[model samples]
Structure formats: C-alpha cells, structure tokens
Target: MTEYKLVVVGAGDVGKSALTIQLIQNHFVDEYDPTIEDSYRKQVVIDGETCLLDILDTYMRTGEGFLCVFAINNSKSFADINLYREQIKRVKDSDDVPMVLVGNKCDLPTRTVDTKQAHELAKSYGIPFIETSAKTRQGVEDAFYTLVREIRQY
Candidate 1:
C-alpha cells in the first residue's frame, strides 16, 4: 500500500478528531469523546498514478506531526494556541509543515471568535485555511481532499 501523511491542526474540541474520522469513515460520531489524548495518527489510502486502484497509506513512520489550533469560540482554547505554538514548531520542525488551519464551529456564528482574523493568520503563515463545521459536515471533505491533492503533486 502506498501511504501519505496528513497532519491536521486546530484547537481541542474544535472537531479535529471528528474531521479525521469523518474523512476516513464518512460518518459523524455523536457523543464523541474529545478528552482521550492530545493527538493520534491513522492510516488511509490515496490513488496515485500508474495503478487505477493503487492504495497508498501513510503510517506515523517518522517525522510526521500535526498542530491543532483551537478557535476563539472557546476563549481559553484560542489563547492556548499561542502558548502551544512554540511546542508545535519544536515538534513539526517548522511552522511550514504540512499543516491545515481549521476554523471549526462554523455552525455557531454567535460564538465565532473571528473568521477574518483566523484567515489572516493562516495567510501570514502560508497554511491552507478553511472554516469547518463538523456538526454539519461542511467543508470536512473539501479540507482533507484539497490538501491531499495539493500535497500529492509535490
């Protein structure tokens, strides 16, 4: 199997895990548990060229990482991103790692921290950004596939 590594970063409870599961399983997990751990990895397949059904799966083989930044919807989580920024850099080797800036909780606009500001931050960092709503499954597939497709050409 051919493998690819996809690192997703966003704040806790921002549906980072949910997005992962949804992309892999195409279903939402209600009553999901978000306090299990800090981070985890999973294997998935991508159809690369040459084989019509070629399967490429990425293991946490080595040097793969993710930094999930929380949104301002949760005031405390948003503040914590900066605190963890250094650690993320230390782990991923740089802020330019294969990263995704997820502005989760699009379903809750009243609780939205700042979409524009978040996009600006992502722009400054050159990380692909998307506002996602795991609850509605909005932008879930687009976020993952878009990144995968772009990174595959590299």
Candidate 2:
C-alpha cells in the first residue's frame, strides 16, 4: 500500500491555513474557517511516487508511541491496522519509533489473527506483537507496558 502524509496544525488566531487548503483542493479557498474536525485528502505524485496527501484540522493525532491494534477475529480489521501504522510513520516522518502490533479480543475463540500470524507480522516489521483481551485482561498490561518501554528507550 502507498503511504500518505496527513497533518493538521491549528494556528488558531495565528491563522495559517493557506498551504493546507491549497494542497487539499488544487484551488485556493481564500478564507479560513479552521473547522474543528474537518479533513481533506487528495492524490499526489511526488518524485515519481504516488500516494495520498491528507490534511485535517483534527483527528489522526497521536502523541509519541503508536499501537496498531485490531480485533483478533476480524481479518479486515487486522488489515486496517496497517493503515494506521503506515499513516503514523508518514505523519511522524520517522521510520524508527515506538510501536506495537496488537491483536485484541483474544478471549474470543473465533479469532483469526492468532499468535503465530501476528508474531510473524510483527517480526517482519521488527515489532513486538501481543494478544490481549479487554475482558480477561490478558497481556493487556504487557502490551501497554511494552510501548511505554519502547517510548522510554528512545
């Protein structure tokens, strides 16, 4: 999947929306509303690479560490976690960061993203993977504490 950059910095009364608006729409808006949770995305080609250039005034913001999580039983949801990891990588513009791939809802017997698969995926990306069940509290602390350990490592 192609990675994209989505950044939304609120200047507030400092008021700088021109670059984002221009990039978002091709044509300039000439006005600044600074909506709280508005988002805009466009296809962009940069240096022969095609990916999405997303902009937003809100949402998609995480402080430091990122936990790419999905339900263990939902294959598509597990896949959706990729978008987040990739998105954060682009947004942070850093390859090496504190992150963990987590398979949630492990209490369910109908799980598809099991231990080996998740571990392999996490290992392929050089990250720690853990199974967690909010109900059972299994590996929940380990998962979170791992990220904290990672964050502290940096």
Candidate 3:
C-alpha cells in the first residue's frame, strides 16, 4: 500500500470544498458557502493498489495529483488556473506534474464559458479536462477514479 498526495486548487469560491466533500462517499449538498482553509484524506485506492487522499490549497512538490478547478458560470474563475499551474510548476519545478483541469458548476443553467474552449485550454497544457457539478454527483468521483487510474503509470 502507498499514500498519494493530492492538491485541490483554483481561485477562491471555485467549489473546492464542495467538490472535495462530494468526492468521498458520493454525497451531494443543497448549497455552498465560503471556506477559509482545509485539508482531508481518505482511502482512495483505484485498482489493486491502496492509498490515502488529501488536499491543500497551495502548490507543493509532494503532490501526486493536482485538481485545478474553475466554474463554468463564472468566467473569471477560468483565468486563474494558469497561475495555479504556474505555482505548481514553480514549487514542483516541472510542467509535467500530474494535473487535471476541472470545470465546476456545470449544473448552472448559465454557461458563460463554452466546454469546447475549456477543454481546448486543458488540452493545450497536455492535461485532461473534466466537467463536474457538485450538485449532480458528477462528480469527480468518476473523475477521481479516472485520474488515479491514469496516475498509476507515473
């Protein structure tokens, strides 16, 4: 068994806590609120391997996986990932760190940012693009599973 460190990042109010909470046990919520700072860990073993999962807002070289989040309804939230990635790159000293570009608030009726563009941006970074709604159980559990499955190789 091994322990994998995961960092959840993006601008403030981009749904980090909601998505992280919904990540374990596949739960949902009625609404969201602001979070000061937080961290969590759970037994998240994708496949035969077993490991623990944890989150922090800062960039660190210890991360085995990075979840860069943004809101589809809030256009400004989309611009901040580059800075996050830059921070990660600076801390880890590598652009090749394991990373995922997430578009949160997908359940919102108003999608100011097109999925194609978002996906394209993630693609440009050579990372996977995922659309998730904390309300829908869309849940990055599937996305998390998918990410860990891929991360096993590196």
Instruction: Report the C-alpha lDDT of model 1 over 31-135, residue by residue, as the tens digit.
Output: 554424433344544444321111122122243334344654786666565555556577655655555566666777577466677777777766777777767
Q: Write the per-residue lDDT of candidate 3 for residues 86-123, one digit (tens) a residue.
A: 98888987767888889998888888888898988988
lDDT tens digits, residue span 1-154, model 2 = 3433333232122112333343344333334544344655667555465555444433344445655666766777766666667787786788776777767667677867656777888887788887765555566556545655566566
Q: Against the true structure, whose lDDT is highest? A: 3
Return whichever of 1 and 2 wins on TM-score. Answer: 1
2 against 3, candidate with superior TM-score: 3
| lDDT for each candidate structure | 0.57, 0.57, 0.77
137 Cα displacement, candidate 2 (Å): 0.7
**For model 2, which pairs clash?**
none
Could you report the Cα RMSD, in angstroms, for every candidate shown? 5.1, 15.8, 2.3
Candidate 1 ranges beyond 4 A from true positions:
32-69
Model 2 ranges off by over 4 Å: 1-62
Off by over 4 Å in 3: 25-37, 57-59
